[PDB]
Structures are given as C-alpha cells and as structure tokens.
Amino acid sequence: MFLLQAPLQRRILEIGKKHGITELHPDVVSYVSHATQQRLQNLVEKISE
C-alpha cells in the first residue's frame, strides 16, 4: 500500500469519531491511500513540469 496501513486506518477511524461515524468498511483504507497517492502524484507531475 502506498500509505502506512495501520496508522492510516487509525487516523481515518479517528476523524470519523468527530463526525458521526462509528465504523468504516474495510477497503476504505486502501481507497483513501490510492486517492492520496493520486493527489500527490499529480502535484509532483505538475511540479516537475
């Protein structure tokens, strides 16, 4: 996984508590990791351009 699975999991779970969320589907972690990799991938590509 691009991002660190354990702390990511914990941090997502953590942000949810503050926002009416009690649980989170499993692969949501991976999905967020993928999205974050895209966010950063585009910026880097742009920066190198």
Q: Please state, in angstroms and rounded to a whole number, the distance separating the CA atoms of residues 3 and 11.
A: 12
Q: Residue 17, SS3?
A: helix
What is the crossing angle of helices 28-48 and 5-17, to 10°?
A: 110
Amino acid identity at 22: T
**What minimum distance in Å lies between the beta carbon of 27 and other proteins?**
7
Residues 1-49 that bind other proteins (CB under 8 A): 2-4, 7-8, 10-12, 15-16, 18-25, 27-28, 31-32, 34-41, 43-45, 47-48
Applying CB under 8 A, the residues found at the interface with other proteins are 2-4, 7-8, 10-12, 15-16, 18-25, 27-28, 31-32, 34-41, 43-45, 47-48
